[PDB]
């Protein structure tokens, strides 16, 4: 990332933050990533809950591709098979531990930046996560913040994570939002959620309508 972004990160989050900008070579990035992920694994081995904000899987994969020796089998985009194998287990370390502790990992990926390997890592990492959140450009052109895509957003095994009552109070919003467009749903939701203090009150405020 840019130095200004990381230096305004150091003074914004109370938790410790580790980063290495693009000034350093890719070896520094990959060794930092491996060191920090293995330290997080050691920490969660102590039945301690750990949450990871990852930026970004595409940049990580590019760094490993640059640093890993070539395997002789290069697919589209100048990426060989063994390059993506390290980020595969890097991202796959997220799980919930039986006896205690939980490693949660939420990561971001670059979209349609014009470089042909970005969609390669995109397609390689699809289907390996418990859930995904999508964002678009046309929403942010009119500056409707956040630019999340409700329709494309989804989760796997929602039943175990929440209760049936709140999950049904979620599918009702799903059925409400499917008919009209995504952006129109964005203004609708932000407008009818602004005056309500909390989503819990919003539930009864909208059910009567």
């Amino acid at each position: 990332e840019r130095p200004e972004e990381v230096t305004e990160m150091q003074r914004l989050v109370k938790g410790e933050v580790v980063a290495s900008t693009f000034d350093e070579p890719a070896s520094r990035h990959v060794q930092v990533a491996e060191m920090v992920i293995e330290k997080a694994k050691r920490l969660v081995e102590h039945k301690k809950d750990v949450i990871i904000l990852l930026d970004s899987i595409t940049r990580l994969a590019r760094a490993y591709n640059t640093v890993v020796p070539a395997s002789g089998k290069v697919l589209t985009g100048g990426v060989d098979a063994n390059a993506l194998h390290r980020p595969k287990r890097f991202f796959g370390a997220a799980r919930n531990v039986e006896e205690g502790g939980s490693l949660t990992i939420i990561a971001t990926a670059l979209i349609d930046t014009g470089s042909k390997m970005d969609e390669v890592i995109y397609e390689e990492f699809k289907g390996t996560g418990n859930m995904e959140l999508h964002l678009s450009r046309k929403i942010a052109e009119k500056r409707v913040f956040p630019a999340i895509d409700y329709n494309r957003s989804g989760t796997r095994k929602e039943e175990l994570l929440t209760t049936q009552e709140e999950l049904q109070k979620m599918w009702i919003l799903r059925k409400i939002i499917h008919p009209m467009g995504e952006i129109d749903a964005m203004e609708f939701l932000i407008n009818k959620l602004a005056m309500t203090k909390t989503n819990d009150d919003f539930f009864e405020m909208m059910k009567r309508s």
Binding site: E99, E159, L160, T162, T163, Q164, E165, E166
Partner: protein, 187 residues
């Protein structure tokens, strides 16, 4: 002893429902003290919602098991008493309703069904003839105090808890929630 053991099982699952209600009341009291107090953490709140949903489902199914066990014991007692009385003095009401019983005995199946429904109407008008007086009586001799304690109409909370109904998929996922809650409680 089938009636006695059925009533014993009814008391057993009624006591199980009582224990479920006690655990529920504990859940609401801890929930209210946590919300009234410094409920700073929310993960415990989410766990409370998770447990209370399946706890309502458990008390609903406990009310269901109690209600149809009560219906079962009531109907078995009623049929036993009817069999005993109607065998004691079968000839009396037999001669009272002889023609249609002869129609039933030596005719075809549809004629038998017609006899059944004619006897149904006859017994209905029989009951309507005498119910106007409404003189007070007691229970059966062998099953007086058992049915007095269990009562004809069950607890009001029992029927109130059965107002809501769950879809079979909802019932299955709530059973899964109960299983995982039991696993968590064991740990």
């Amino acid at each position: 002893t089938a009636l006695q053991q059925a009533f014993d099982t009814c008391q057993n699952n009624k006591a199980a429902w009582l224990q479920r209600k006690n655990e529920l009341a504990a859940a609401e009291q801890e929930y209210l003290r946590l919300l009234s107090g410094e409920g700073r953490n929310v993960s415990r709140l989410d766990e409370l919602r998770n447990i209370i949903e399946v706890r309502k489902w458990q008390v609903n199914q406990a009310a269901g098991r109690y209600i149809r066990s009560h219906e079962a014991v009531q109907h078995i007692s009623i049929r036993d008493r009817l069999n005993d009385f109607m065998q004691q003095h079968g000839t009396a009401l037999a001669a009272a309703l002889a023609p249609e019983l002869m129609g039933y005995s030596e005719l075809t199946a549809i004629a038998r069904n017609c006899a059944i429904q004619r006897a149904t109407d006859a017994l209905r008008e029989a009951l309507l003839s005498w119910l106007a007086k409404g003189e007070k009586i007691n229970y059966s001799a062998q099953d007086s105090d058992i049915l007095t304690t269990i009562g004809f109409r069950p607890d009001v909370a029992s029927v109130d808890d059965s107002r809501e109904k769950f879809t079979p998929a909802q019932n299955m996922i709530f059973s899964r929630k109960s299983a995982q809650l039991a696993s968590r409680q064991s740990v």
